[PDB]
Design a protein around this ligand. Structure first.
Ligand code: NA
Lengths: 208, 216
């Protein structure tokens, strides 16, 4: 079946000229249909930017401030969203699409003059029948980020909380509940990954 | 530009019950070709939007017959006949009769459930963090319902309200429960200058606040 995968540079400064990629498989972008770029802002509002026909001709949203175009490469079977001078207000998640019936996961574009930062990973060990621990990933930029428990083996009774931005730094916490007989007789380690800063951290939760 | 209004914004419904979402258009969406290119998507948490209904009433592959769409001129309805859990998220209408293509603002579908009180946990600053001159106190409020929930952060009996970071999860479809996290952050100084750290939670499930604490 038809699959679409977005990719992009992640973080960029204002006035930066830039391009996003949609790689299509299982279906040719020359064959048929219209191939779209759609944008989701925080607050979850969706906005249609444009498409490129299968003829290589384009149609755009004339009601936008953003300067952009859409292009393709029929041979690698990709199409592209080129943004000409991003502003802060271009921050959001960008989706690519065949019409409306097939979407990519999405790719996050952050437009900031803030500098990349590796996070501090902090272990939250306790002070009943079950038990609760925690991870505090603080002061990183940008996202995304990656948190698992015991290398992702442990996934039950976990709660990863959406990051929250304070002074151009993100903070993210994680919860996980296990049975008293489990900890700390068995080791529970927290697994942090911030690709942006090429950081990978593993923090085992010790008691006290 | 064609504006689409969705009703309502939120929408609690019981498992097994029929839900319906309404979308209203600022213009007729009838093409010359006689077709009404009004379509329906669902965005599950953490996922990308997914096509349910296209051209008003045509159901996309793999989409359960439970899902149906109808409507009349400038009013449109999506019906979900026998609500299951997987069904939770944000529902969007869109139009493609007119350029530019526009989306409705979305309608969050919440699953009705048995009121449930948070499982609270309080957490002291790490050694590591303490070393750096940082002091963060974390409080988890897990697996509660409904979503409405206030927290207070008390230091030595009285209430702090500067340096509080709150984060809520989307509704868990595994049990229809929500979850929150709150982080109070102070200077290693401001910290070691007080004894008691209290995390107070207010909620329908209790006429009284749920209290978790510790002594530094
Ligand atoms: Na058309």
């Amino acid at each position: 079946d038809v699959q679409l995968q977005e990719s992009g540079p992640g973080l960029v400064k204002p006035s930066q000229s830039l391009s996003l990629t949609c790689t299509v498989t299982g279906y040719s972008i020359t064959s048929n249909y219209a191939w779209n770029w759609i944008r989701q802002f925080p607050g979850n509002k969706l906005e249609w930017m444009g498409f490129i026909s299968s003829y290589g001709t384009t149609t755009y949203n004339p009601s936008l401030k953003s300067r952009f175009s859409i292009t393709r490469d029929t041979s690698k079977n990709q199409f592209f969203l080129q943004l000409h001078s991003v502003t802060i207000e271009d921050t959001g998640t960008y989706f690519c699409t065949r019409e409306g019936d097939y979407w990519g996961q999405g790719t996050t574009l952050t437009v900031s003059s803030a500098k990349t930062t590796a996070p501090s990973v902090y272990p939250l060990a306790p002070v009943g029948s079950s038990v609760t621990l925690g991870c505090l990933v603080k002061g990183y930029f940008p996202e995304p980020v990656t948190l698992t428990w015991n290398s992702g083996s442990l996934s039950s009774g976990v709660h990863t909380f959406p990051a929250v931005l304070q002074s151009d730094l993100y903070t993210l916490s994680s919860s996980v509940t296990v049975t008293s007989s489990t900890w700390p007789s068995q080791s529970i380690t927290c697994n942090v990954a911030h690709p942006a800063s090429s950081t990978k951290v593993d923090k085992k939760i010790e008691p006290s | 530009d064609v504006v689409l209004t969705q009703t309502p914004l939120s929408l609690p419904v019981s498992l097994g019950d029929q839900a319906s979402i309404s979308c209203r258009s600022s213009q007729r969406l009838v093409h010359s070709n006689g077709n009404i290119y009004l379509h329906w998507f669902l965005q599950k948490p953490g996922q990308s939007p997914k096509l349910l209904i296209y051209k008003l009433s045509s159901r996309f592959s793999g989409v359960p017959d439970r899902f149906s769409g109808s409507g009349s001129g400038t009013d449109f309805t999506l019906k979900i006949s026998r609500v299951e859990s997987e069904d939770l998220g944000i529902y969007y209408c869109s139009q493609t009769t007119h350029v530019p293509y526009t989306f409705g603002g979305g309608t969050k579908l919440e699953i009705k459930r048995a009121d449930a009180a948070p499982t609270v946990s309080i957490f002291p600053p790490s050694s590591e963090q303490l070393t750096s001159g940082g002091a963060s106190v974390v409080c988890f409020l897990n697996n509660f319902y409904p979503k409405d929930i206030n927290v207070k952060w008390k230091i030595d009996g009285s209430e702090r309200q500067n340096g509080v970071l709150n984060s809520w999860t989307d509704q868990d479809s595994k049990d229809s429960t929500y979850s929150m996290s709150s982080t109070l952050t102070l200077t290693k100084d401001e910290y070691e200058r007080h004894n008691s750290y209290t995390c107070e939670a207010t909620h329908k499930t209790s006429t009284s606040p749920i209290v978790k604490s510790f002594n530094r």
